[PDB]
């Protein structure tokens, strides 16, 4: 049947699907690749640019660029191509037949969502659209009405407290510190062993390494001493040319940057202190309800044993009479989308879209009045 | 201001840049006389736009924000606070005094501090208090041009007095009782 489309459209991984499902139909890296050489063979696949999984497959002869950076679109000529490949190649559905539900991180330039609306209406002519905050959709997917979401998105981390469905827009916190920064940090610290990764096709390999071998340490100094004293914590990975690398101490130093941004030369505070401060920004009479409903999300919170580290840090920070319960579902990587497939499917929501004629009347600035 | 600046697309997050933001504030911000009218103006004309030059050579351009930052002083609901604005605070602190002295207080309200150096805060405060207070009383916002140093200037005026020399807390007295003496001598 006819149902709204839900396009997560994150900073590192574009996930799109139909509303009313329990899994995104299409998931692919949001990259655009263009060749950096000149073909010599006649008639063999001479085309301008590859996008999505096709770019990952042929990444040897392309230069990969991400359109979204730190949750902000910095190249619209590529974001348009991403959405075009999502509509006509991945979902294979006409754009002007279904409403769309886009996502955006909180505390973002208004020009971003204004241009999102302008693109969705002028270019693709969708009959309706909506731009919801990602953490709210994550909480909807969690299946509750109160708690603090900590969406450590790949491109951006942010915490949004919610109580009884009343979001507190003065306690939202955003930290530009996420999967891509950890990837760059891993690239920077891998040189100590002697492995040199410079090009983007190698950054993809570094991301595949991070997504597989890295893990967060329950106690940093203890793990460092253990890795220094004994070679029992090293792992082996095979690059896609036959080479074999062995990473030890590095494994838990990449995700440790999340809790200590000082490694990356930032003045900010770890995600644990970010969540604690976002909780203490709320009025006291609800803080307990948040302490027991801390929810994780995003593909950067899939590291093994991150719930334990977060719980330990928050228990050390928060008073000793509040029950801390880090709600970390084993499906968190898609929660932001899952809640979408819920929100677009509700019957009390069909009057909250941004109709095409509303835009035609009030300009693209109507997204600020309609979307929260 | 740091929070609302991200709307335009400028991300100041470090304590080093908080100083830059404070400078932008005390250089370009100003209090609107009629907030809704200024919001309608800034959203329909390029007459509020002002450019600031960061220390690295970039120039940012702030419009609306120029009067949204100090407007919070009169509508704390912008910061999620529950309390009332500074004009309502003044009016309430006046109304809690005796009835006989309300007129003199109405006539001799005096601003101070470094946050009242906003172009157009005296007139806004006068308008608000006149709207709150009755019609027979006269409101005069005594805003001197040196109100950034009044707490010091007056502080000097007090210390130079000759009748004040008895109100000091001498070393012997602190040696007698202790740090609690500040609760008795000092009011």
């Amino acid at each position: 049947d006819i149902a709204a489309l839900v396009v997560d459209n994150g900073s590192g991984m574009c996930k799109a699907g139909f509303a009313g499902d329990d899994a995104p139909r299409a998931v692919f890296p949001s990259i655009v690749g263009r060749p950096r050489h000149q073909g010599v063979m006649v008639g063999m696949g001479q085309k301008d640019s590859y996008v999505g999984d096709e770019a990952q497959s042929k990444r040897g002869i392309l230069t990969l660029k991400y359109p979204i950076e730190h949750g902000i679109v910095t190249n619209w000529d590529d974001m348009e191509k991403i959405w075009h490949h999502t509509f006509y190649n991945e979902l294979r559905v006409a754009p002007e037949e279904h409403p769309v539900l886009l996502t955006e991180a909180p505390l973002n330039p208004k020009a971003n969502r204004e241009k999102m609306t302008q693109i969705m209406f002028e270019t693709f002519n969708t009959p309706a659209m909506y731009v919801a905050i990602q953490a709210v959709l994550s909480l909807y997917a969690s299946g509750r009405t109160t708690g603090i979401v900590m969406d450590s998105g790949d491109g951006v981390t942010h915490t949004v407290p919610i109580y009884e469905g009343y979001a507190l827009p003065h306690a939202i916190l955003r930290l530009d510190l996420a999967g891509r920064d950890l990837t760059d940090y891993l690239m920077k610290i891998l040189t100590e062993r002697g492995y040199s990764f410079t090009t983007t096709a190698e950054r993809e390999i570094v991301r595949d390494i991070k997504e597989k071998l890295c893990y967060v340490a329950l106690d940093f100094e203890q793990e460092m001493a253990t890795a220094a004293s004994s070679s029992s914590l090293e792992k082996s990975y095979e690059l896609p040319d036959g080479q074999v690398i062995t990473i030890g101490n590095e494994r838990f130093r990449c995700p440790e940057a999340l809790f200590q941004p000082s490694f990356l030369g930032m003045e900010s505070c770890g995600i644990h202190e970010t969540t604690f401060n976002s909780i203490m920004k709320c009025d006291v009479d609800i803080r307990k309800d948040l302490y027991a409903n801390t929810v994780l999300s995003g593909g950067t919170t899939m590291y093994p044993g991150i719930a334990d580290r977060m719980q330990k840090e928050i228990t050390a920070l928060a008073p000793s009479t509040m029950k801390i319960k880090i709600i970390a579902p084993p499906e968190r990587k898609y929660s932001v989308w899952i809640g979408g497939s819920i929100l677009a499917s509700l019957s009390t929501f069909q009057q909250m879209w941004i109709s095409k004629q509303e835009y035609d009347e009030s300009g693209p600035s109507i997204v600020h009045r309609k979307c929260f | 201001l740091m929070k609302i600046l991200t709307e335009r697309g400028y991300s100041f997050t470090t304590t080093a840049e908080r100083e830059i933001v404070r400078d932008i504030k005390e250089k370009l911000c100003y209090v609107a006389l009629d907030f809704e009218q200024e919001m309608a103006t800034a959203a329909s004309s390029s007459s509020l736009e002002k450019s600031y030059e960061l220390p690295d050579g970039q120039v940012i351009t702030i419009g609306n924000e120029r009067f949204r930052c100090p407007e919070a002083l009169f509508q704390p609901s912008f910061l999620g606070m529950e309390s009332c604005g500074i004009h309502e605070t003044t009016f309430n602190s006046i109304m809690k005094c005796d009835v006989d002295i309300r007129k003199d207080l109405y006539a001799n309200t005096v601003l101070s501090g470094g946050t009242t150096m906003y172009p157009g805060i005296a007139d806004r405060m006068q308008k608000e208090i006149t709207a709150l207070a009755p019609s027979t009383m006269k409101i005069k916002i005594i805003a001197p041009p040196e109100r950034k140093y009044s707490v010091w200037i007056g502080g000097s005026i007090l210390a130079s007095l000759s009748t004040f020399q008895q109100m000091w807390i001498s070393k012997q007295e602190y040696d007698e009782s202790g740090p609690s003496i500040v609760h008795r001598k000092c009011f």
């Binding site: 950076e69 730190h70 910095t74 330039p109 | 335009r8 400028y10 100041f12 997050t13």
Partner: peptide
């Protein structure tokens, strides 16, 4: 971003 940070 436009000012501060890249994006």
């Amino acid at each position: 971003w436009x000012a501060x940070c890249p994006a």
